[PDB]
Symmetry: C3
Amino acid sequence: HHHHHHKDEVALLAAVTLLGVLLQAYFSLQVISARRAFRVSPPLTTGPPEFERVYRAQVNCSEYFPLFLATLWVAGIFFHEGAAALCGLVYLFARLRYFQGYARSAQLRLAPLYASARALWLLVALAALGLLAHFLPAALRAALLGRLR
Amino acid sequence: HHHHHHKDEVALLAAVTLLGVLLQAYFSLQVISARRAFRVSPPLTTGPPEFERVYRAQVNCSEYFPLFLATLWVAGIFFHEGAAALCGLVYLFARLRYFQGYARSAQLRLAPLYASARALWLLVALAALGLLAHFLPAALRAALLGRL
Amino acid sequence: HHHHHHKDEVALLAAVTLLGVLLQAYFSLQVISARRAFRVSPPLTTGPPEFERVYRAQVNCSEYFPLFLATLWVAGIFFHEGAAALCGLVYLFARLRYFQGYARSAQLRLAPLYASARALWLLVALAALGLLAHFLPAALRAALLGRLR
Ligand SMILES: CCCCCCCCCCCCO[C@@H]1O[C@H](CO)[C@@H](O[C@H]2O[C@H](CO)[C@@H](O)[C@H](O)[C@H]2O)[C@H](O)[C@H]1O
Ligand SMILES: COc1nc(C(=O)[C@H]2C[C@@H]2C(=O)O)ncc1N(CC1CC1)c1cccc2ccccc12
Ligand SMILES: COc1nc(C(=O)[C@H]2C[C@@H]2C(=O)O)ncc1N(CC1CC1)c1cccc2ccccc12
Ligand SMILES: COc1nc(C(=O)[C@H]2C[C@@H]2C(=O)O)ncc1N(CC1CC1)c1cccc2ccccc12
Ligand SMILES: CCCCCCCCCCCCCCCC(=O)O
Ligand SMILES: CCCCCCCCCCCCCCCC(=O)O
Ligand SMILES: CCCCCCCCCCCCCCCC(=O)O
Ligand SMILES: CCCCCCCCCCCCCCCC(=O)O
Ligand code: NI
Ligand code: NI
Ligand code: NI
């Protein structure tokens, strides 16, 4: 126990984070359901194209999920909670469309893939700007103090 | 520096996290050892079924690891540290049995897989309840104030 | 809102985290570029060895990213911010060399792979020591108080 909590500075980030977990659960579910429909038994990860695209979509979302996370949280703490959470949401909605697109074809994944990438770059930029705002003043000051002597 | 630290509210979550890291290390070690026994040289990922099942078991535990993490932390902060840590432990022990099961066969993976899924779902539910507790009162209040 | 922030205790961790995200971006970019040069269209993940090595290097770095993250943060918070950040940087730089090595051959990946593993074990050790320093005193004290009664 302390007599204050910082929950209330990260609750939006936490909500978006959870939403991302749930979205991954939906993607796994679709993979399970593709495994049944095209009869691809674990441990195999190859099969008909229609299976491979679903499986790949899920794998690519899972692999980007930690990156999404890390940049969400850095942006949301160093830049602005609300703005990070919102880019997060745009990221997740884009990945849902990416997943749906890819299921249909390689080509129909592209537009939402690009939109996923833009939303993730926005998170990167907000995180970077936030970190710059945190470190740049002291560093400029130290450099000016050095030249002043 | 501040004159207080919040470490002590997250130390169980941190211990469980690290335990999870160590478990992944054990899984990688088994994969390395299966690569030697069945002579599957990187960058190959395919080979005899006994190699593929170990390899897949590891890749599936790696891929769910961040999900475990995220929910572990959200649940532990917004619901209850101890309860989240404990579900976490149950998740990790279930994955260790899943890994061992899968090595032996596709079929023996299933019971511990299901247990691992139940444990993760519990973490999800805790995280969701914790977030509901945080947001719901102010939202109901704002709505009541609007109607007044 | 609050009248203190803990940003300034984790800014180095956050910066190393973001550097890690950027490095994964660089790795993906090399994968895209290898897909074009060797004509391997998603959803395929197999192709000429030169493509497979790049692709594997990227996958292995993505899969260890969250482990790196988790241990970076636990070490940075329970042991020492600066020392964790520094081992983080050595981890990332080694993975860059691992990636470049692996692109050229299976064999050239090994030295920087071993350096990546050492740097991650150091983070694991710093995390474990920090957790020990947090829990061990109260536990020893409780055990002694029990025997004293
Ligand atoms: C070391 C630090 C490195 C930092 C690097 C940072 C790079 C930052 C790049 C940000 C790229 C943002 O680019 C911008 O993305 C948005 C969001 O999709 C696009 O917006 C687009 O999507 C939205 C839907 O969500 C619609 O309004 C419309 O379809 C379109 O305008 C812009 O058309 C594009 O120009
Ligand atoms: C541990 O959770 C899960 N693990 C696995 C495997 O590890 C499978 C691939 C390995 C194999 O076949 O051996 N699969 C499904 C799992 N579920 C089920 C959910 C999809 C309906 C899940 C339960 C709770 C939350 C979740 C969040 C995201 C994804 C899933 C969540
Ligand atoms: C960076 O650490 C490791 N990286 C890789 C690769 O990236 C391999 C797949 C790439 C290739 O072969 O090209 N493999 C094994 C690694 N080890 C050592 C292992 C004995 C447990 C590890 C060292 C330190 C901590 C760890 C934690 C979890 C898993 C592993 C940890
Ligand atoms: C979501 O961002 C990205 N996603 C994907 C896929 O999910 C691909 C594998 C799926 C497929 O082809 O179906 N690829 C590239 C992406 N970019 C592009 C950037 C690297 C040049 C990225 C944008 C912003 C930050 C980033 C950080 C790391 C990696 C990438 C970052
Ligand atoms: C991947 C998600 C990681 C989330 C990390 C969030 C940690 C910030 C909160 C500090 C912990 C203390 C806040 C008081 C809450 C409590 O313990 O009751
Ligand atoms: C939108 C978020 C809500 C998600 C709710 C997830 C449901 C929790 C399911 C838990 C079922 C586990 C059954 C108990 C385990 C056992 O019998 O040993
Ligand atoms: C994804 C792995 C977990 C991320 C963990 C973030 C937890 C942040 C806890 C609050 C940080 C402030 C306390 C700093 C203590 C110190 O530096 O001495
Ligand atoms: C339960 C916690 C286990 C901790 C295991 C830690 C293993 C640490 C090994 C570090 C080896 C460092 C040797 C480096 C030599 C060099 O880099 O030049
Ligand atoms: Ni008190
Ligand atoms: Ni002071
Ligand atoms: Ni505080």
